[model samples]
Target chain A: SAVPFHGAHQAGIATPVQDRLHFAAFDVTTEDRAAFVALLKEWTAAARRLTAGHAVGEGAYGGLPEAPPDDTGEALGLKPSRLTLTIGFGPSLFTRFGLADLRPEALADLPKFPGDNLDRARSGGDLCVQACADDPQVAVHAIRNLARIGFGKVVVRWSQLGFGKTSSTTPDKQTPRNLLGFKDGTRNIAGTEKDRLDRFVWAAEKDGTPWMTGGSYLVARRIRMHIETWDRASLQEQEDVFGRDKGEGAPVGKAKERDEPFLKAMKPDAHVRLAHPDSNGGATLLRRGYSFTDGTDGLGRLDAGLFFLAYQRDIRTGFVPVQRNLATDALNEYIQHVGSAVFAVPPGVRDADDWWGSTLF
Target chain B: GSAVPFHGAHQAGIATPVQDRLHFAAFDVTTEDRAAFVALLKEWTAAARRLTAGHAVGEGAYGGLPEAPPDDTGEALGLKPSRLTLTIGFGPSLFTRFGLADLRPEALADLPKFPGDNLDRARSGGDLCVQACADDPQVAVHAIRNLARIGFGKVVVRWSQLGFGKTSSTTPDKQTPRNLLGFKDGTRNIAGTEKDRLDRFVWAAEKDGTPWMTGGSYLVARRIRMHIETWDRASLQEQEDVFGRDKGEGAPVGKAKERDEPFLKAMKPDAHVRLAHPDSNGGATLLRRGYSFTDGTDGLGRLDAGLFFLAYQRDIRTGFVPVQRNLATDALNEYIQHVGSAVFAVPPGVRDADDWWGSTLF
Candidate 1:
């Protein structure tokens, strides 16, 4: 069931090039939505002009990914420049870093990707759109150029997935919490229903500023799947590792994915082991995720992976604590945490000029 | 011009072995040796072209520095591709021989400048500290180029830099090298305090090797070009469920992001949910100095992730080990798993050595 080898090669180029360039991503928010959108439009357009044709393309992923179905060409207002461009060190960087003695020409075989691949791989990129402190003209310019370089797809549709306590509530539940899923609250924060949802959404209070009252949430994870191998594992082995069955996700020792299993109850014979328990005796983390496929590889290969993204306000309480308990979890026998990264995703933005977490910190 | 060039997936595949090839190491030198180094570099670059035949491009610099004694790769080359970089120290004390009484580069003529910044009023003379890079080659060739560049006499006087590509390790042997993923990665990183500085860079931890190079630094080069995708495919819910938190949120069952911050505070019981349930022993932590790289894409649409993860620590056990133990079962585990790793025992600092690696470090 192991993932077959997907090999890539390159020559001439070095392994870790001189870092003459860098890329940073951020979330943009502001009070004046219209004004913010205008600013973004300007910056993105300007950035497009600077980089020239080596970049700039529009497609299904950035802004205006999908044209007006009705042919009216109505403007679908998407704020924030969700684009990125990396100006790498060509021979030009040599003088920048002053390595005149080194020749970069022999490095041609390095980064050995088929030229045609760009036509295909350009549609996908990490889903990070920096909305704050960016020049709108730069955003537009960058977005346009990147579309040409290889970024062909852009998601213009706004997400129903919002942020923080007020963002997580509903009318029937009205307090804002996890998504439409029902089991959302079973292993949630400990607080009377009387408390505002904000109580659970935020990590710390910004006693420093008034502009930062309603900010919260940040998420991360680097995950991939060996679908073939995983599909071949036996039910018992799978159950042992995941504490859940492959057929219906019965708690390794339980009956189903949704049923209150031995995991939370820690029933003596319960499917979930007592080895890793929560401080509050509750097993948490309302997982809202989706599967994704970047593309396919050679010999009828499929380059698919799980885009395991999530949101939570506190680092310690939300991610660290829960993961620690599952250390010896049967899952470790099969899963591998290879490429790990940690980032501080600031609070949601309220407007274009009023950077979300910028003021508080 | 139409293509907005940024990095994409397809990086190098970490696989089988290959023949030994050429390698290069760039160093930051004092202005005094700049002339000698430049002349030697020109010869070295010429040698590289001669060695690679026409398969390689001739060497040159960028910016408006001077003519041959100066300037650079100012737009003469064509499109670009993948590359790598590495850094190590001379520990200390090599500066005196080069007549660098001040240690750091202060001479304007000896400095390096950003090639594109010719118009800038502030940096016409360039900045201090020289930089360099090279194409792919095994460790041997890289050492050869670095050594031949002035016989290492001036190199040990300061820091050393090297670059290479395509790691040569497979599944089992490479995955378990107590990488930064392990807990104590930074126990030996350069010490910030003057008191701890000596032993931190030069010598091994009290628990490890010798102390001749007390406070002498370690020069480590690792190339991890693969991950265990076979093991990552477990059910998503199963992953978070085992981790005792949301794989997406990293949140415990009930609490929010702030209630029980790990790394900073012990797991809480009254308000916090313990994923790895705390014991009498404290939690582990490590500092990570990592960079992402890309070699190119394979035809299968697969892109390689170039990871250059470096760290230092005064003690390995106290720093990287314990924390790695805690991370053994993190829910984030499903996405990536180690595939290649190596450990190089960094040698002691030299006083006036020419071939440091050949002498003790190697």
Candidate 2:
């Protein structure tokens, strides 16, 4: 149940979304560019073995009787579980290490949307690693081992563990529910569509950043849903908020879930109408979000919502335009965007010798 | 795809062969009237009966009146029960209020403070507790959330925890899952198939001085935080010495296989395996079912992750107290901490359609 790591691009983006996730953003603590580059190479070496279900170095016990084991043994006997490790660099990383020139214009900062209540501690980071797997422990082990290897060089700025996946790249598989109890990913771009992946998902060489070719831009938003308030809402109002029936998940006037949505039939301020690509100059995004519940809000309500993840050829045309269009969305009454971040994900390693940032550096 | 029988001789969760996901909550009951609280308990039990049978709570999510709030939350509509089990318990604090002090079980006393327990007040004691487990995480979360929603103002959540992976299993023949410390935990745990042991050690009897808790069990829950980074930096041999189990094969210090009975003298004097072994603790045993959890990170940039230990027994005094006291000198304490603790008196399961929770008590 393993996904091959060697490829033209990173495996996670197009790989079928796993059942569990351990996503973390790290802060680069050192100013040495050489040290950072060598760290990336080291991470790639470990990543290669881990994705193939092999232990690192002496396999956690053989050669290290007196010293720490080379690999954490928690993942022993557990298969690869289709593990995928995706690495990226935020715009803040380019400022340090004198690599500011390497930052692409498309890797711009995310703007403050209308109702954003972003938290500083959870927002910005120099780098990020997204670990996804079918098993939760395997995913956690990957992140912990990676963080252990980066010891004094990098520290985790923020992290999230998502139990139930909220989206699916493989349309034929499960279409999960968001925190709002609505069917998500019905209209998302499928990973099997090669034309769309090239045109909308992957960064191109013609975008004036040749080094970023075959890469993708990522945008994350931590949205807090007022589930208590939403639960108290009438069924019709809940339907009105999303412009879809709660039972069948059909559009306002449509009969079934996959029926073509009509903008005219929905309310002018309905969420589906506003966030639809038709209303946002045909701008689309491949959303792979996960539902999150971080205890409570201290006022007897759960601090639960969605951890929204989006990937696109460029940030400017994708997440930005569509988010700006949602300023008038009726669904905003029950949710608020709390934490935001952006990253410039690099291309995949080609072979055993090629590293994560090989194309760029 | 099948349902676990909710109506039985005892509550389902404890020995139901642990589920993959858990959503556990300890709530603080606030109703002033004992009558209202009794009615609330019946309502919760009635709703639970429907939920465990893979059915909705009331008239169903969308079938109810559009003007009124849906009785069922509707999220679990398309989902199966997935072996969902909801187990209820009464904390020590629940006895003091509502003039029910006389009904308190002697075995449900608050746990004594251990030597190195850095107990957090907010995470520790509570008036009532609910344990929800299912093969699917969403199913478990939905079960607890709906039960909480059903209780409304009578009960407010004190502290809630979510666990994704099962750290201990009850099916002894199946492959064992590892704890955060990277070793196979609960290797010698009492399995669900040991009926005679269940009678002697796990289930309480009518003659045990608490008629309300016949066929019931006492639960001891502890939140053990494993110092992930510190333990990862230790020598492989040092790690094995502390647990008295080899890293690769999970075998005992001198034994060839994991299932082999460990010779207590073959390992260090303070080794955890020897100290926690029943042979070392007057032959007292516990039916352990635990789950691993990670609540983001601590203030010092360390993983606030650990095991949510769940142990059921005939009496907490004879089961957890003596064993935990024996483990105070345990070498594994250097890498672990008991940050949260609670003990509850669980009631017997419903016997018929007319029966409800706490029916045997009041």
Which of the numbered candidates is closest to the native, going by highest TM-score? Answer: 2
Q: How much lDDT does candidate 1 score?
A: 0.28
Query: Each prediction's Cα lDDT score?
Result: 0.28, 0.86
Q: Per-prediction TM-score, please? A: 0.28, 0.98
Count of clashes, each model: 135, 0
Q: Write the per-residue lDDT of candidate 1 for residues A2-59, one digit (tens) a residue.
A: 1111111010011111111112222222234354335444443433333232222242
lDDT at A46, model 2: 93
lDDT tens readout by residue for model 2, A1-361: 9999988899999878787888888889888888988899999999998998887766878774899998988899999999999998999999998888999998889888898899888887898998988888898888888888888899888888885542222223556677667778888888888888898889999997988899999998888988888888888888888888877789988898989898788989998988899898878888877777766545667778888999999999998999988898898889988778899888889888899998777
RMSD score of candidate 2 (Å): 1.7
Per-prediction DockQ: 0.01, 0.55
Q: What's the C-alpha lDDT at position B310 in model 1? A: 34
| Candidate 1, B1-362: lDDT as tens digits | 11111111100110111111112222334445645644544444333322222121233211222222111111111211112222223312234444534432111012122212112221111111121222322212222332333233333212122222211112222211122111111222222233334343223443444433233333222333433122123333343343343322234544454223333233332211233333312632222333222333332323333344333333334444444445444553444434322222223322221322213322
Model 1 lDDT, residue A361, Cα: 24
After superposition, candidate 2 runs with Cα above 4 Å error: A165-174
